[PDB]
Design an enzyme around this catalytic site. Sequence first.
Site, PDB file in Angstrom:
ATOM      1  N   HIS A 121      16.700  33.419  -5.285  1.00 11.61           N
ATOM      2  CA  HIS A 121      17.107  34.506  -6.164  1.00 11.61           C
ATOM      3  C   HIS A 121      15.914  35.170  -6.845  1.00 11.61           C
ATOM      4  O   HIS A 121      16.049  36.290  -7.345  1.00 11.61           O
ATOM      5  CB  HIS A 121      18.109  33.994  -7.206  1.00 11.61           C
ATOM      6  CG  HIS A 121      17.542  32.992  -8.163  1.00 11.61           C
ATOM      7  ND1 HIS A 121      17.597  31.633  -7.940  1.00 11.61           N
ATOM      8  CD2 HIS A 121      16.918  33.151  -9.355  1.00 11.61           C
ATOM      9  CE1 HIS A 121      17.026  30.998  -8.948  1.00 11.61           C
ATOM     10  NE2 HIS A 121      16.605  31.896  -9.821  1.00 11.61           N
ATOM     11  N   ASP A 199      13.723  32.259 -21.089  1.00 13.26           N
ATOM     12  CA  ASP A 199      14.897  32.214 -20.220  1.00 13.26           C
ATOM     13  C   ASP A 199      15.745  30.984 -20.525  1.00 13.26           C
ATOM     14  O   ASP A 199      16.961  31.085 -20.757  1.00 13.26           O
ATOM     15  CB  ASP A 199      14.446  32.223 -18.755  1.00 13.26           C
ATOM     16  CG  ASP A 199      15.605  32.128 -17.782  1.00 13.26           C
ATOM     17  OD1 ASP A 199      16.565  32.906 -17.936  1.00 13.26           O
ATOM     18  OD2 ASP A 199      15.551  31.287 -16.858  1.00 13.26           O
ATOM     19  N   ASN A 246      11.781  19.577 -33.127  1.00  8.12           N
ATOM     20  CA  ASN A 246      12.491  20.679 -32.490  1.00  8.12           C
ATOM     21  C   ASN A 246      12.477  20.508 -30.978  1.00  8.12           C
ATOM     22  O   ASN A 246      13.530  20.511 -30.326  1.00  8.12           O
ATOM     23  CB  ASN A 246      11.847  22.008 -32.895  1.00  8.12           C
ATOM     24  CG  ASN A 246      12.859  23.127 -33.080  1.00  8.12           C
ATOM     25  OD1 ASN A 246      14.066  22.892 -33.168  1.00  8.12           O
ATOM     26  ND2 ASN A 246      12.365  24.360 -33.139  1.00  8.12           N
TER      27      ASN A 246
HETATM   28 FE   LIG Z   1      17.948  33.470 -16.617  1.00  7.48          FE
END
Ligand SMILES: [Fe+3]
EC number: 3.1.5.-
Lengths: 462, 439
Positions: A121, A199, A246
């Site tokens: 992709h 992302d 974190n």
């Molecule tokens: Fe993504």
Amino acid sequence: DTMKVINDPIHGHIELHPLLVRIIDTPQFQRLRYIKQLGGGYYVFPGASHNRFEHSLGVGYLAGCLVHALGEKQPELQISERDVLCVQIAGLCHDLGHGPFSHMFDGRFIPLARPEVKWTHEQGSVMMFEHLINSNGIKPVMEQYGLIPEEDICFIKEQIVGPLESPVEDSLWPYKGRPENKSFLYEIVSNKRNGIDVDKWDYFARDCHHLGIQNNFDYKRFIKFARVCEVDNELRICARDKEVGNLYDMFHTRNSLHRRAYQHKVGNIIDTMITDAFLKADDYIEITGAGGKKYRISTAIDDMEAYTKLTDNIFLEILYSTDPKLKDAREILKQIEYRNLFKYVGETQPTGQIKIKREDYESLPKEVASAKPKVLLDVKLKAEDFIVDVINMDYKNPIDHVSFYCKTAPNRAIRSQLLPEKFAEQLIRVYCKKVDRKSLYAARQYFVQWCADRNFTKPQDG
Amino acid sequence: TMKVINDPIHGHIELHPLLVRIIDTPQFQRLRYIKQLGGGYYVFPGASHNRFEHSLGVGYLAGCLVHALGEKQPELQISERDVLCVQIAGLCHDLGHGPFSHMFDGRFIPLARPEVKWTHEQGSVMMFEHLINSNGIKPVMEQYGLIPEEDICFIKEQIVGPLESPVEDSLWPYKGRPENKSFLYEIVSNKRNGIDVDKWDYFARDCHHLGIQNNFDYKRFIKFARVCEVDNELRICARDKEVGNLYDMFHTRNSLHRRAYQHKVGNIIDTMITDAFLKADDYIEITGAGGKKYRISTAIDDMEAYTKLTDNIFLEILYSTDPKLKDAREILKQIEYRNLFKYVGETQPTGQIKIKREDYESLPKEVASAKPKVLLDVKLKAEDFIVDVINMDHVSFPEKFAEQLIRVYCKKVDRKSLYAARQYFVQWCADRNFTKPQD
Ligand SMILES: [Fe+3]
Ligand SMILES: Nc1nc2c(ncn2[C@H]2C[C@H](O)[C@@H](COP(=O)(O)OCCCNC(=O)c3cccc(-c4cccc(Br)c4)c3)O2)c(=O)[nH]1
Ligand SMILES: Nc1nc2c(ncn2[C@H]2C[C@H](O)[C@@H](COP(=O)(O)OCCCNC(=O)c3cccc(-c4cccc(Br)c4)c3)O2)c(=O)[nH]1
Ligand SMILES: [Fe+3]
């Protein structure tokens, strides 16, 4: 032309530069409204109806935020608004190449239809990006806002897919969009080395929002305390030491999402069923591409005009079809509606062995049916009764690969078992289309013998 | 047996086997392909959710409320059979929705077939009957203690209201349950005080997906709800200290209506999608019962065809190559390019007057017939206008609100045409005796 404001449930108000808006308002980008983020997971998690479009918007927004914060904190890096816009566009367009049901399409369908071809992709994102630019006159707009189309298009594609390859010497900066003094920019949208990029931040938050899972990672805090610092004569994004906790949460959240949702048993069985229907429909569905040429589901990736019209809609196109030659495919999809699903037979791992390659997926069912269980078994099974699902967890690089800095010496990077367990990078599951109990007992016998033959893990449940 | 679902707003949801068998049918699974907010998704990227999950939530909340009442007040005699019937009614209340939800029965059918009276509730009853008869549900209902004769009628009455009103006969009109169980009809769809589990679920869910603050807590309602007599009738009553929660709910609703449901661009896009549907109606084919082919606007006369009418129609038009569909296609393409109908103005009907769906199609013609006052360089035909009518909807123990809004958009975009459209609009408001528009 001016900025636009979109209200998002994850990020609140996100501002969009007019160039980003021009890119978004194209068929090639709006296409992502029709590809579900989690593929078949929506048939197990009713809240998981979200698509790649909103996630892409989030990724663009986060890329902009991180790069702007780094520029504001450190003027010396010479981060320009041109650089910010290019990073934002890369974040926006990184998922353009996804096909129907996202990771199902390139993960399993294309390998089964055309084992010979090598499709990702990310390649599709590059191709769709070129097509979107040349189909919509984006280059003059880019120039309008100070970008240099040749260099900056190369830079965006490099962020999305990686370097030109041709490793060769490999002792040399492989990128061409930007020089080494901007290397950290390549670590924003997609960071393979350590697994921390905007992302993942967006889809962690969004998937947790839609699934009902708690997300303990505060990306906003991490952005506030991120900086650029020097490691081995190179420049990398580094985190404040105080941020360690974190990061722990982030990784744990990742693990949860993988264990509870991404590799859910029924969800993956349903992905398998959808792929089977696509395979049985491939010869009869036409998608019209460039020049009125027809394409199949499995060949639409070769013409971006056709790919632009290949979305989850194909599912419904098969379900609503009246063509007799599609009946087979239709029936499988109807079994999904009636909840008459393939039966889970078992799970195994190729621990200590070579991992299974995509080019060989198609051969696996035959192998399973060719196993010789050492008992009469009074029921014979064929290849088409078996499904072999290869589930790859793609990241062995824990927190260790992250760079930290002290508030005393920000410019320089610093030199437990409580960290999340290992990932088990490849799982292999087997399902059986036959549902009578005798056939299932036989299928389990075949599966265990096959695992023995391949030297894979002895299946649990026994 | 008992499945558990993991909803993002209700958490874990246990489901009775009867409900699962009702859900696992094409007729119910169809709701996975109808967006809850129609075209709102083109304005709110988070509003990707569909009627299916909302319906699950409504069934679950109806079960919760009925069972909570049953644990208390045992004198009401709520059987598990009552709980199951109420759960099914909540589960199936939206089965009749069409593509893009309220766009379909609210605008598209009125413009396409001005003479038919169609609602998504009556569609829900039709589709529920079709689901029962196509998947042999009656024996399963018997297996779990239901009386199909009484109880199917009970569910349909919960969804659509009384089957009666052919004549006056003003008394108890429900047949599925006696008057002593009247309160059960107030749970899934409450016509009196606008308080029902359907609204609870979709307020919470639309807030969750839109990014809008949800100020109320339905759990407090359920925990402190009772049944009490009010003016010689059993009804759902609330402990007084809950008023603060109640107000919060009405604030959330108000916000949801002003920020999202009445969003100017979202309603324009609903209109554009409807225009595309109209220009595709003569050509789009939907196979139905016996192989008979239907149109989008006639698929409501055959539940077999309606089972296959979802938001996919949109893409079917976008991806088509048939030249006869070109016009429809182009409208959808404009949506993709963000070249939208231009907003001309807004007005309100005066007094109690309410424009009725059967007259929607007349409104553009009227607008094009008004004589502007001064003169005009450009002249616009009725096809150049869109008239969008937007509607908005005593509990036992603060903002604009306007029963109807009329907005006008123009299809021609040049400045001259938009000035002309404004002139037409203001004159038409003068002729109908509507409130003079803004500015
Ligand atoms: Fe993504
Ligand atoms: N039902 C439902 N669940 C849903 C839904 N949306 C989300 N869920 C959540 C809650 C569920 O507990 C969870 C997992 O799904 P499951 O159906 O419970 O199956 C789990 C085991 C593996 N499945 C099969 O092998 C199977 C399952 C069932 C039947 C058959 C079968 C029957 C007869 C003939 C044949 Br041939 C096959 C096979 O997904 C929904 O719309 N419906
Ligand atoms: N862009 C976008 N926004 C999105 C998206 N998802 C959510 N949003 C949010 C953020 C936006 O602030 C908000 C409202 O939408 P808007 O696009 O900004 O338009 C506002 C006025 C609409 N009215 C028009 O007539 C109009 C508007 C603009 C141009 C034209 C036009 C131009 C040339 C020829 C012709 Br002929 C027509 C017409 O929606 C998305 O995917 N894309
Ligand atoms: Fe509802």
